[PDB]
């Protein structure tokens, strides 16, 4: 199946002569597995999934040392950007980076990612070829030229095609059960008053993992897209997710409507209806 690893890094500058705060979070198959935060009492990369406990003291020491180097790289880069954009020092500014790889079932890199944002807007990104850069900005053209001179794309390509893929694979092996577990949604329909002679039916799906899900309503087996409200999928807070979809229906006609829930943890899609 189609596995991924990402590291999402953030540096935020602070008023006065204060140092930026730097946070780095790592994800395997979209679940946080390690985190570093410079606001911590003893900043270090720390496990965030129990299966990361397998790694020995050296792994953590080396990851931590890399984080500390990244922290300084972000500090200098922030300062550089203040220059490019003729911005006044001692403000609040953000620099973010996403990097990582998607792997195939044959364990080849399918796609590599290396991209940056300043103030939450695209700054510079490595193209899918892993060889050239897209810069979004006149300022980012300075970076691009600098990184064409230094051969930075090759450095990142080598990480994306080697270490990224190799370690992702190791992490998948180590988090054997955990990483591959799905939780199927439990679903139910609720019924609520609404305007004169109409009611709301709301189809709920709870306790599911991964986040990906599709909820549909039908009237006598015919689809409904017209007049369906649905919320953004949202965390329960225990690692699983929630979603609902509702339709407005004539009073008395609630049994004409059917909710269908599609999720990859299901042996097949759920069909349900209002059950008073």
């Amino acid at each position: 199946g189609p596995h991924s690893m990402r590291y999402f890094e953030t540096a935020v500058s602070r008023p006065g002569l204060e140092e930026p705060r730097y946070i780095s979070v790592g994800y395997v198959d979209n679940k946080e597995f390690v985190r570093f935060d410079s606001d911590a009492e003893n900043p270090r990369y720390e496990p965030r999934a129990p299966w990361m406990e397998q790694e020995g003291p050296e792994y953590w020491e080396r990851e931590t040392q890399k984080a500390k180097g990244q922290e300084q790289w972000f500090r200098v880069s922030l300062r550089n950007l203040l220059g490019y954009y003729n911005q006044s020092a001692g403000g609040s500014h953000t620099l973010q980076q996403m990097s990582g790889c998607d792997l195939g079932s044959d364990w080849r890199l399918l796609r590599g990612y290396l991209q940056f944002a300043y103030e939450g807007r695209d700054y510079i990104a490595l193209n899918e070829d892993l060889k050239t850069w897209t810069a979004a900005d006149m300022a980012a053209q300075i970076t691009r030229r600098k990184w064409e001179q230094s051969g930075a794309a090759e450095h990142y390509k080598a990480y994306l095609e080697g270490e990224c893929v190799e370690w992702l694979h190791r992490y998948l092996k180590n988090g054997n059960a955990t990483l591959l577990r799905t939780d199927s949604p439990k679903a139910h329909v609720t019924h609520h008053p609404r305007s004169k002679g109409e009611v709301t039916l709301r189809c709920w799906a709870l306790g599911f993992y991964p986040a990906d899900i599709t909820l549909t309503w039908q009237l006598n087996g015919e689809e409904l897209t017209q007049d369906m409200e649905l919320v953004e999928t949202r965390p329960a807070g225990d690692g699983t997710f929630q979603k609902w979809a509702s339709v407005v229906v004539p009073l008395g006609k609630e049994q004409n409507y059917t909710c269908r829930v599609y999720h990859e943890g299901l042996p097949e899609p759920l069909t349900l209806r209002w059950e008073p």
């Binding site: 590291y7 890399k66 980076q97 290396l114 940056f116 230094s150 990480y159």
Partner: peptide
């Protein structure tokens, strides 16, 4: 395993 960045922005 985290990447190490090369040249600064």
């Amino acid at each position: 395993k985290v990447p190490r960045n090369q040249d600064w922005l």
